[PDB]
Amino acid sequence: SHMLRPVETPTREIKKLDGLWAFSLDRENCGIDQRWWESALQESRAIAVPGSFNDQFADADIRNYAGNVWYQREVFIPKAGQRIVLRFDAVTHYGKVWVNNQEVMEHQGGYTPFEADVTPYVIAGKSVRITVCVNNELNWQTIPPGMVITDENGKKKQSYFHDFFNYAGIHRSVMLYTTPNTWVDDITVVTHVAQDCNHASVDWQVVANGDVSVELRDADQQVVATGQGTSGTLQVVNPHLWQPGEGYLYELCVTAKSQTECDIYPLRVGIRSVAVKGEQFLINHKPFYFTGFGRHEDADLRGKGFDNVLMVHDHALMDWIGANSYRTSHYPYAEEMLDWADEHGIVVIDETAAVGFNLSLGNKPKELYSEEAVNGETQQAHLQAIKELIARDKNHPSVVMWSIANEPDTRPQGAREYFAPLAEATRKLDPTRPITCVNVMFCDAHTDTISDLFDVLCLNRYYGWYVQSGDLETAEKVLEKELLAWQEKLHQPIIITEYGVDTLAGLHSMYTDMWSEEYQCAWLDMYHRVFDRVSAVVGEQVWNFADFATSQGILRVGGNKKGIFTRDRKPKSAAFLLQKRWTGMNFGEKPQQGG
Amino acid sequence: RPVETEIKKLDGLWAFSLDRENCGIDQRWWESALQESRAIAVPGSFNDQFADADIRNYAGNVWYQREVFIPKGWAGQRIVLRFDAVTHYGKVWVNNQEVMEHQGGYTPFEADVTPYVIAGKSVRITVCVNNELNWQTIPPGMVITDENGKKKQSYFHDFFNYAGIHRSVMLYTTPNTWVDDITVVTHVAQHASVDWQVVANGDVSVELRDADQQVVATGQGTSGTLQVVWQPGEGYLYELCVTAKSQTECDIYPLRVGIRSVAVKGEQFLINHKPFYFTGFGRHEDADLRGKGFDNVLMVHDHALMDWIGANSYRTSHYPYAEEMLDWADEHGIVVIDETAAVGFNLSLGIGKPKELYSEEAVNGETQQAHLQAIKELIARDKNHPSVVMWSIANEPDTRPQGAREYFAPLAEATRKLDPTRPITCVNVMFCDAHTDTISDLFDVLCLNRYYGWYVQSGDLETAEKVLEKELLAWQEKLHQPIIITEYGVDTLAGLHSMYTDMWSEEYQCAWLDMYHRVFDRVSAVVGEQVWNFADFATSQGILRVGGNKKGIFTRDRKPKSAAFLLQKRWTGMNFGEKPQQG
Numbered sequence A: 001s002h003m004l005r006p007v008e009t010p011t012r013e014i015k016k017l018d019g020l021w022a023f024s025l026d027r028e029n030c031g032i033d034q035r036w037w038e039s040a041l042q043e044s045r046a047i048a049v050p051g052s053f054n055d056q057f058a059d060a061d062i063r064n065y066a067g068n069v070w071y072q073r074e075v076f077i078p079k080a081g082q083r084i085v086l087r088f089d090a091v092t093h094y095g096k097v098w099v100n101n102q103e104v105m106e107h108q109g110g111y112t113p114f115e116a117d118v119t120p121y122v123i124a125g126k127s128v129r130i131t132v133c134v135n136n137e138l139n140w141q142t143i144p145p146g147m148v149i150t151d152e153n154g155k156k157k158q159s160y161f162h163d164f165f166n167y168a169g170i171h172r173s174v175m176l177y178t179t180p181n182t183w184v185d186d187i188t189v190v191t192h193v194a195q196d197c198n199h200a201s202v203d204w205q206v207v208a209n210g211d212v213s214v215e216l217r218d219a220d221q222q223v224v225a226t227g228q229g230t231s232g233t234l235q236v237v238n239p240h241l242w243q244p245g246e247g248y249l250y251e252l253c254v255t256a257k258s259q260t261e262c263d264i265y266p267l268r269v270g271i272r273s274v275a276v277k278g279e280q281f282l283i284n285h286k287p288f289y290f291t292g293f294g295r296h297e298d299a300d301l302r303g304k305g306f307d308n309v310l311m312v313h314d315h316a317l318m319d320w321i322g323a324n325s326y327r328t329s330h331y332p333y334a335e336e337m338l339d340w341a342d343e344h345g346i347v348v349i350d351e352t353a354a355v356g357f358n359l360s361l362g363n364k365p366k367e368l369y370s371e372e373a374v375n376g377e378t379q380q381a382h383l384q385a386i387k388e389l390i391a392r393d394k395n396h397p398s399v400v401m402w403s404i405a406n407e408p409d410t411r412p413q414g415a416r417e418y419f420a421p422l423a424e425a426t427r428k429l430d431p432t433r434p435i436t437c438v439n440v441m442f443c444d445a446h447t448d449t450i451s452d453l454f455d456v457l458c459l460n461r462y463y464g465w466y467v468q469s470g471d472l473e474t475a476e477k478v479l480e481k482e483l484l485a486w487q488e489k490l491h492q493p494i495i496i497t498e499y500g501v502d503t504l505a506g507l508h509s510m511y512t513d514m515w516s517e518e519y520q521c522a523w524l525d526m527y528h529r530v531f532d533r534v535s536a537v538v539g540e541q542v543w544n545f546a547d548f549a550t551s552q553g554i555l556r557v558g559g560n561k562k563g564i565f566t567r568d569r570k571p572k573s574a575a576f577l578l579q580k581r582w583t584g585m586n587f588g589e590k591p592q593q594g595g
Numbered sequence B: 001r002p003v004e005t006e007i008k009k010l011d012g013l014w015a016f017s018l019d020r021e022n023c024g025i026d027q028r029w030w031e032s033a034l035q036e037s038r039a040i041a042v043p044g045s046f047n048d049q050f051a052d053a054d055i056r057n058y059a060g061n062v063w064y065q066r067e068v069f070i071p072k073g074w075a076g077q078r079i080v081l082r083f084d085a086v087t088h089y090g091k092v093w094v095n096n097q098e099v100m101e102h103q104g105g106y107t108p109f110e111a112d113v114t115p116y117v118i119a120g121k122s123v124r125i126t127v128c129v130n131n132e133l134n135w136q137t138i139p140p141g142m143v144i145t146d147e148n149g150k151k152k153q154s155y156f157h158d159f160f161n162y163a164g165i166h167r168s169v170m171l172y173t174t175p176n177t178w179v180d181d182i183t184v185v186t187h188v189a190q191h192a193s194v195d196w197q198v199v200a201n202g203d204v205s206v207e208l209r210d211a212d213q214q215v216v217a218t219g220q221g222t223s224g225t226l227q228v229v230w231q232p233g234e235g236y237l238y239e240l241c242v243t244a245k246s247q248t249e250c251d252i253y254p255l256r257v258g259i260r261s262v263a264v265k266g267e268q269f270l271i272n273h274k275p276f277y278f279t280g281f282g283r284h285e286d287a288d289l290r291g292k293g294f295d296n297v298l299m300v301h302d303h304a305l306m307d308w309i310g311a312n313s314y315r316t317s318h319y320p321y322a323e324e325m326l327d328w329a330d331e332h333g334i335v336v337i338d339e340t341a342a343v344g345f346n347l348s349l350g351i352g353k354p355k356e357l358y359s360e361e362a363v364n365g366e367t368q369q370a371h372l373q374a375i376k377e378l379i380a381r382d383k384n385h386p387s388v389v390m391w392s393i394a395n396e397p398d399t400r401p402q403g404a405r406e407y408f409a410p411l412a413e414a415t416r417k418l419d420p421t422r423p424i425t426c427v428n429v430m431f432c433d434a435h436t437d438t439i440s441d442l443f444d445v446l447c448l449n450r451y452y453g454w455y456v457q458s459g460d461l462e463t464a465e466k467v468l469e470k471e472l473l474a475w476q477e478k479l480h481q482p483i484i485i486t487e488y489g490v491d492t493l494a495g496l497h498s499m500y501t502d503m504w505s506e507e508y509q510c511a512w513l514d515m516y517h518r519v520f521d522r523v524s525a526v527v528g529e530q531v532w533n534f535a536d537f538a539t540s541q542g543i544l545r546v547g548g549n550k551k552g553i554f555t556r557d558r559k560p561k562s563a564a565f566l567l568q569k570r571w572t573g574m575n576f577g578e579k580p581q582q583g
């Protein structure tokens, strides 16, 4: 449907985000049968929302549990005559909500919010019970996809194809918000600029039988433009347009009035224009250079759960290190991260949860794009995730790119058949932004067959790590050669969205061999040397802020160790190399082929 | 091995030089002092010694050199130069005259230098050491080159390819009647020990004592020697003086020997007619800073750790150890499975190339010959040791392609004919289970390497227990042979802890070593356990090695992980030489 983030005005929120819900497992799938919605928690225990249920009890048998978990919470209802709505900003994978024995709504998104209108079903003044059924399972039509395997005892074991651990549960806000019966439930805003001198910001919104008078107030509450109608444009003059450095943000207050009731919604948008020209990524008609991380929503104890201290601290670290950009790696991030990126002018490459469409990253199906794995319904679900992501992050000026999928195996015939309609559909959904598909390493420029449909070429390369293990002299030649081959092929702006190596924070060696910090430094350094002599490399993005948790494997030593920082946010030796490089260059500009 | 009744030339430092342009043999570098040399220490691998990244991985020709004074007291005696071990290949020159060469690596080679040496004046010694491996070296490998002539060596074993001079170099003197060859075989029923001898212009008079010069038998001849009437606890060993008499000079050579006879009966390993149970480690010749170089301090300390942790046996894993380890081994009476450098005969161990392992371009002809040679030398050096109870021809070979059996049968035959007094084995890899292995019948004891719960069924104890159990008792029902598990271990970061007891944590090494021990306890054919590696050790660079192999109970600087005390409780809590009665 339509997605508007709620905000306090003559509108109200009761943060049911309160922790300490009742939590229980359903190892027998008796919950849907035995009507657990009715009343009690049976044999529950205290859990905390937001937060992943896997790491929260230090029980291994819970963290690998694959099935149905039950959340439970009684709450009181203060808003009368207002539309009361129950919003879940994120319930990872599947969630079915119940308000006092009655199914309200359900979702199969994972990292996208879903809400429901509960005005008839509640009465402001008495209690009410909310029971959530959260499913953490992945089959071939989920985004991301997976394979759940039962064995001889019927015990479910979830296997997937991405790297990060499949943290599940309620990860973001659960809120009970309250809006007048004539609401402003959808908005779209597109901005243009000409020579940083003047241009318009077209408006568009959806009401509940009310008219929309829209004003454009300033950063100090000064009206600069008005407008009367459901559509149309409106022009500023000599704007304070949104730059990657500062990030100026106008406050467009929209009004939807009825003959009796009225609703006012303030929506912050910044004037900026993002486009791709040849091999240049232009923000406000200036060629840009991306620097920063591909991070994860990962932490100790809470898993993929959200928390504010992590936001302010992580943004302080990136702010110190000189990073100006990041990419919401492998799933839509919490909207709060994108609000911060909006105010602080942080350019973001947004991505969907489509990751793992690849069976070469080592009882696996034998054809990746057959009916037994990634079929038409996988394509429908992928288009769904695109729809929801764009419908949530469409107005945020910090998003400059949509990324449909991550590292798909494109060698087999049919990858183009699967991905081309999704490129067409995404271009038809949001024309204001470039589109991309992050490229796997074993699909170099001479075997890929998908990168033509996208505006920006994103690359994940690990020459010298997975291949040429320990060889810098050779990985330099290979890396430079394939980079110039991508240039000779597509003449596109090339952002390296992943490049990193594993490093035991504390492992040193005089020989600068793999897994030591000296190898991380020398490796990133050589990669930077190659980066500086390719004209079409419009951005670099290291593989990963900090070490994150992965599934158990013989390649993951307590998870992925390719982070610049540790899981507790401590810098390895390479963090200060990146400090020197990024903070030493001119902001938003590519190095002049050398310092 | 020399004694007397010498000047150990390995003292101090040698001149060391690299040959990147490969000019040495052509420009005759041995006939002069090494131009642009630097000090190097023997014994010790040259790779780790200088903290130089380029020196560590260098593949080519290296040059050692050292002047020495030949003592005046050796006027009319034969002067012999002995290299206890020069890893992979070595060509030795003595003062403008080429004396010797050897492609062994982990076994000694000596040469008579009496003419080329005049005792009293200083002579120079130049050694050319090669660290290259092709398909005819033991272990095998293959070198690759490109533009700029940069040579890059790739091999198929795990441990890092350390090279150089790894053990002492001796310069011993014997009278002109020497005892070049000696053999001794001991028997025991419910006995004695035949003697042997090879000499030049000298007769053989053999006597043997016990504690001190207290002869308790004698014999005059090159056969028989039987008379009056060695344990894994203490290790009682008699002293056998051999005498070679000539008209002018006489020679006396003392050889310690322990009375013992090893034999396999059904599914039991009998040392002195008693069922045994193997406990201990499969270790390595690896250390901080010195590579595979030998050192007495390390031997004393590691033997202290093995004594404390309750180990009674170990296997000289993947190459012949320094013979000092075996002298200590029969001194304190620790059971040793001796093994050749035959490792890496497998193309299936891929971190994630010819087309068939037993083709002509890889493993055929000189490969089989030189393997038989590594056998002949290992046996010709370690035959008399009572601590050696087992022969081990090869380790983890791929026996699935066509032609593996045709390869391994003749080696088993010749090796058995060479030393019939000891059982023989071949440690097979994990990818070849009971239904696919085709060689385990040729050998007396079957050796197993198993990693259920690590490489396959990664992190799942509940099923790896079943697979290990089924595979084990299926082996037992299949061949009805004694099965020693010679490798079972999992990697572990020394300081990584985890409440969930998942992989790489010490809790997972503890819980993973435990389940394997219960499945061990419910199987009658398992005649021993040897946790994979004693200490973490250096390997080649891969994405599966976090600064080497972390499958050690101890770290590289010999510091214990959480499993060291678990195993010290298990091995010393049971009775010595006995297996638990299924619990």
Ligand SMILES: CCCCCCCCC[C@@H]1NC[C@@H](O)[C@H](O)[C@H]1C(=O)O
Pocket (backbone or CB within 6 Å): A163, A164, A360, A407, A441, A442, A460, A462, A466, A498, A543, A560, A562
């Ligand atoms: C057959 C050739 C394979 C080439 C190597 C592919 C490496 C893919 C790297 C992986 N790319 C995806 C990212 O989420 C992971 O964290 C990253 C990693 O594992 O470090």
Ligand SMILES: CCCCCCCCC[C@@H]1NC[C@@H](O)[C@H](O)[C@H]1C(=O)O
Pocket (backbone or CB within 6 Å): B158, B159, B349, B396, B430, B431, B449, B451, B455, B456, B549
């Ligand atoms: C089904 C087989 C899956 C792969 C099993 C690989 C077992 C190889 C055993 C290897 N054997 C050689 C030894 O030096 C090494 O330490 C050990 C290892 O892995 O580290």
